[PDB]
């Protein structure tokens, strides 16, 4: 297996398909409005990887985080605390 990234800038009318379990992220290059249609929708739950609320990484106990990440439990924990916003954030460089 080989991890891969699919990046692309979408214009009005363009479509992107996002498979379940695939991590995704997107930035509004201009004021953005999108419509999504999800299939196999029943019981879908959204898991976040960054931000403050609903961040699954934040739920991993320090002992194990320490073992799964190169940094230390405390270090990992702090890093996940810097971002105060949730879901949508300021994507400025």
């Amino acid at each position: 297996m080989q991890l891969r990234r699919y990046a692309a800038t979408l214009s009005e009318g363009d479509i992107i398909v996002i498979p379940s379990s695939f991590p995704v992220a997107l930035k509004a290059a201009s004021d953005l409005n999108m419509v999504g249609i999800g299939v196999n929708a029943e019981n879908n739950e959204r898991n976040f990887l960054a931000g403050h609320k609903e961040n699954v990484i934040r739920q991993i106990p320090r002992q194990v985080s320490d073992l799964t990440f190169p940094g230390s439990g405390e270090e990992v924990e702090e890093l996940l605390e810097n971002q105060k916003e949730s879901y949508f954030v300021d994507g400025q460089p």
Binding site: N47, I60, P70, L79
Partner: protein, 178 residues
């Protein structure tokens, strides 16, 4: 020729380590059109030695986990908190797709053998695993994002994100509990 028979050799080994292994059985309809009705299912087997941990990861499929031998600790991570389960030889539990989870062999002398029945739906017959940890076999899927996206998201300088959670740490996905 017996198309209904699947010997141990027909198990592709996904990851071997001196602490344990994870194997995946070939698709049931790989060599025969007689098992089309089993095309959505894959069988996996997991074996680990005493005091070992399978790093957290989420699967893209539904898993029916069954403890064949040994004892195990199962932690299911929710975005809200988490649930811990103590599994005994013979116990079974369903793990829903997308739920990150890790497995522990708490025993000090007995091994852990687990049968995983996967029910696929995203890509029929295909089961994928997403590991949060960077290893030799594969880097952390978080690393696939650009530097800008990561910095904005975590709101921290990149090289600090890199050394705290993206840097190749463990050897494999199965490590040993201290």
């Amino acid at each position: 020729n017996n198309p209904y028979l699947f010997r141990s050799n027909k198990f592709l080994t996904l990851f071997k380590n001196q602490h344990g292994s994870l194997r995946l059985l070939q698709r049931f309809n790989e060599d025969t059109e007689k098992l089309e009705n089993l095309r959505d299912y894959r069988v996996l087997e997991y074996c680990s030695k005493p005091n070992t941990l399978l790093l957290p990861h989420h699967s893209d499929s539904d898993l029916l986990v069954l403890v064949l031998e040994g004892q195990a600790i199962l932690v299911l991570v929710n975005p809200d908190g988490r649930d811990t389960y103590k599994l005994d030889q013979g116990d079974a539990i369903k793990i829903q797709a997308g739920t990150p989870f890790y497995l522990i062999n708490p025993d000090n002398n007995q091994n852990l053998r687990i049968l995983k029945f996967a029910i696929t739906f995203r890509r029929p017959g295909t089961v994928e695993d997403f590991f949060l940890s960077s290893t030799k076999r594969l880097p952390s899927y978080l690393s696939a994002f650009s530097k800008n996206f990561l910095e904005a998201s975590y709101d921290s300088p990149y090289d600090e994100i890199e050394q705290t959670l993206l840097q190749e740490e463990q050897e494999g996905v199965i490590v040993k509990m201290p």
